[PDB]
């Protein structure tokens, strides 16, 4: 589906609604029908919903790179003048909500609508027709939203205690619906290690063999130890699918969704990814993931590492200032001294950040971000290239958390501009190539 501004939809379908409201007594002749739509008499809207029903439309966003750049959807009248786009198709369209626009086309002939619903329908195209990998697979929020749900926390609230002596195990629940009643109260934590009895879910292949081996369990109860979230996670997958019981990285979700397309019909993956979306968002907001000057940490070893390599350069600079050193090797020595010195801060930085820090969880789960990106935010930004392409031996010691200096900022722009200019002519050339490949 897609959100279609009601004004836009009225004009697109204007000839259709004109006939429908003349068929009904609303308008006596086509002339009246035309004016009735132009001035937007309130009667048309109930008519528009009928014509639009199960009548697809094509949505394009330029530039169109692969055929996935055009996809059919079922229109839904929406309030406002903007267009509502499903969050899973942003990957194919390369669509940012920074203010991009999209085009709508109305297939008319029976054949055109057939091709829309069948060939180009949104849910039928999931994997990219290049690598076969899944595209509509969740990303960004939905990643960190699920990664939080499935993750297992040691010493959480209500954790199964493996009780001894005077008390029974204490970590068991009659059913999942009980773990929810325990979660609503402060008893249970969604990330807890407790073990539950599950009637409606399927155990893993291995354990299913030892447990039953006479068949599988639609109603047959079995017990495993998993986080309450991992339970709810597997309720999103098909009832026939085995219990994964893992914390979901992006690649792990790729493995799973990739597998569903082999063992299950398209319509099944279409609905399973819809369910991952709703779940991922809900937990993305409950994830408690924000940013702050506090949540940005810098390693205390940065001072010693920095001042240490400084003398190593000053000594090599003293060796070059002594006349013996080769000028080309001097900078090369500095470039090597500082290059791997950045790795140390990167190593020290990772050691410092608690695994639950919101900045790293974003990169860990594979939702978005890189480590090289979080290395310039805190710690050091590193060396920057000169205009000629050579590496400026003067490193940037400060990080964008502490802020750069007057000269540090002027130097970074030297490189930062060359990169942004490249992206300019990288699209113009890449498109000229594609035009020759196509021909």
């Amino acid at each position: 589906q897609c959100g279609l501004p009601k004004l836009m939809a009225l004009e697109l379908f204007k000839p259709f609604v004109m006939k429908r409201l003349v068929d009904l007594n609303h308008a006596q002749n086509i002339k009246s029908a035309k004016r009735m739509v132009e001035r937007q008499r309130p009667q048309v809207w109930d008519v528009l919903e009928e014509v639009i029903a199960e009548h697809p439309v094509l949505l394009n966003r330029a530039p169109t790179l692969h055929r996935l750049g055009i996809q059919a959807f079922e229109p839904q009248l929406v309030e406002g003048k903007a267009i509502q786009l499903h969050p899973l198709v942003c990957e194919a369209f390369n669509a940012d909500f920074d203010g991009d626009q999209m085009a709508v086309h109305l297939p008319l002939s029976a054949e055109a609508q057939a091709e829309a619903r069948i060939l180009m329908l949104s849910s039928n195209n999931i994997l990219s027709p290049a690598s076969g990998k899944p595209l509509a697979m969740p990303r960004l929020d939905m990643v960190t939203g699920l990664y939080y749900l499935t993750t297992l926390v040691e010493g959480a609230t209500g954790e199964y205690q493996a009780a001894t002596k005077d008390a029974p195990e204490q970590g068991v629940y009659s059913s999942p619906a009980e773990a929810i009643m325990a979660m609503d109260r402060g008893a249970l934590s969604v990330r807890a290690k407790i073990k539950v009895r599950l009637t409606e879910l399927r155990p893993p292949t291995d354990l299913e063999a030892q447990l039953f081996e006479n068949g599988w369990k639609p109603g047959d109860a079995w017990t495993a130890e998993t986080t309450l979230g991992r339970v709810m996670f597997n309720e999103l997958l098909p009832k026939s699918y085995p219990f994964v019981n893992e914390q979901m990285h992006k690649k792990v979700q790729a493995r799973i969704i990739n597998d569903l397309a082999e063992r299950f019909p398209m319509i099944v993956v279409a609905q399973t990814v819809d369910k991952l979306k709703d779940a991922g968002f809900y937990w993305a907001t409950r994830s408690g993931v924000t940013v702050s000057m506090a949540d940005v940490l810098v390693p205390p070893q940065k001072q010693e590492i920095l001042e240490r390599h400084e003398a190593e350069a000053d000594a090599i600079e003293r060796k070059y200032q002594r006349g013996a050193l080769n000028h080309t090797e001097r900078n090369e020595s500095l470039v090597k001294i500082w290059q791997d010195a950045t790795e140390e801060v990167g190593k020290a930085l990772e050691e410092f950040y608690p695994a639950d820090n919101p900045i790293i969880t974003i990169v860990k789960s594979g939702a978005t971000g890189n480590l090289t990106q979080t290395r310039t935010l805190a710690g050091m930004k590193g060396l920057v290239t000169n205009p000629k392409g050579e590496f400026i031996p003067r490193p940037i010691k400060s990080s964008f958390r502490e802020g750069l200096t007057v000269l540090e900022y002027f130097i970074n722009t030297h490189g930062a501009r060359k990169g942004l200019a490249d992206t300019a002519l990288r699209t113009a050339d890449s498109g000229y190539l594609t035009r020759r490949l196509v021909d």
């Binding site: 009928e50 029903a53 199960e54 009548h55 697809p56 079922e74 029976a110 054949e111 609508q113 057939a114 091709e115 619903r117 069948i118 060939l119 329908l121 849910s123 039928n124 098909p238 009832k239 026939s240 299950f264 019909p265 398209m266 319509i267 099944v268 279409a270 609905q271």
Partner: protein, 76 residues
């Protein structure tokens, strides 16, 4: 197989439809020409062999007919 319930355009599922035709392309002309047939009736002449929905569009009808194996075709 339980896919739950498809809504509107997604019903019937393509998987159940593709077993009734050689490819996704053949399926297109299949339902396409039949829908063009239905609309002529409301003005070839035959169908709606199934029970028409309330306002249901003829193309949507022809899709349900192919799902029920109510018609057959022969490729050129």
């Amino acid at each position: 197989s339980a896919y739950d319930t498809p809504l509107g355009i997604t019903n019937p599922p393509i998987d159940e439809l593709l077993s009734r035709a050689s490819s996704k392309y053949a399926l297109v002309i299949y339902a396409a020409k039949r829908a063009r047939q239905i609309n002529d009736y409301y003005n070839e002449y035959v169908g709606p062999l199934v029970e028409p929905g309330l306002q249901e569009k003829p193309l949507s009808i022809a899709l349900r007919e192919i799902h029920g194996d109510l018609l057959e075709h022969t490729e050129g």
